[PDB]
């Protein structure tokens, strides 16, 4: 079964927030 | 389909995947793929980046879905201390504390797990 923890690990983690904001702009 | 899910408004979606920084026009394969967006915070992800199955992809689009970090238990409506041990349904991706399921769970289930909403349907 999946948990919040296993789901976090499965994705490999978010890209940097600053890099996300540079693209949105 | 749950009462609080129909009732609560949804955030403005951010049109960039939080994992690959791609868009609905480009995922990690540089191919189009619609984003899934969190109803609470508006952040988004490609289902491929979320590692969704085809079932999860088709089902969460119709629901008031929450991202991994916003997810609250569908019974007690809280995140709780043991939020890391909250189970995610393998059909609808809703979260449940083990103690908040019916029947309550004391040991972590093995293999696929389907929540009490999805089992009868
Ligand atoms: Zn992505
Ligand atoms: Zn969120
Ligand atoms: Zn709960
Ligand atoms: Zn379910």
State whether B45 and A11 contact (CB < 8 Å): yes
Residue B69 C-alpha to ligand 2 middle, in angstroms? 6
- Sequence-ordered alpha helix ranges (H) in chain A: 4-11, 17-24
Eight-class DSSP state of B88: E
CA–CA dist B99, B25 (Å, integer): 41
Distance CA B21, CA B28 (A): 9
> Alpha-carbon distance B103 to B100, whole Å?
8
Distance A15 CA to ligand 4 centre (A): 28
Experimental method: X-ray
Residues of B in contact with A10 (CB under 8 A): 51
The secondary structure of B34-82 as a DSSP string is PPEE-TTT--EE-TTTTT--HHHHHHHTTS----TTT--BTTT----TT
Place of tokens 């999805």: B118
3-state secondary structure of B26: strand
Distance in angstroms (rounded) separating the CA atoms of residues B107 and B76: 19
CA distances (Å), origin B69, targets B53, B95, B97, B111: 19, 11, 15, 23
Domain count within chain B: 1
Cβ distance B93 to B70 under 8 Å?
A: no
- How many other β-carbons are positioned within 10 Å of the β-carbon of residue B60? 20
CA distance B89 to chain A (A): 7
CA angle in degrees (0–180, nearest 5) for B14-B24-A8: 65
Sign of the alpha-carbon dihedral angle for B59, B27, B29, B32:
positive
- In which domain, by residue range, is B49 found? 1-121
């Amino acid at each position: 079964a999946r948990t919040k923890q296993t789901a976090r690990k499965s994705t490999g983690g978010k890209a940097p927030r600053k890099q996300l904001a540079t693209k949105a702009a | 389909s749950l009462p609080h899910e129909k009732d609560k408004p949804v955030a403005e979606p951010i049109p960039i995947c939080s994992f690959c920084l791609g868009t609905k026009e480009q995922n990690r394969e540089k191919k189009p793929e619609e984003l899934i967006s969190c109803a609470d915070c508006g952040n988004s992800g490609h289902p491929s980046c979320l590692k969704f199955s085809p079932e999860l992809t088709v089902r969460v689009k119709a629901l008031r879905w929450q991202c991994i970090e916003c997810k609250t238990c569908s019974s007690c409506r809280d995140q709780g201390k043991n939020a890391d041990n909250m189970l995610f349904c393998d059909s609808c991706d809703r979260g449940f504390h083990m103690e908040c399921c019916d029947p309550p769970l004391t040991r972590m289930p093995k293999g696929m797990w389907i929540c009490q909403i999805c089992r009868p349907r």
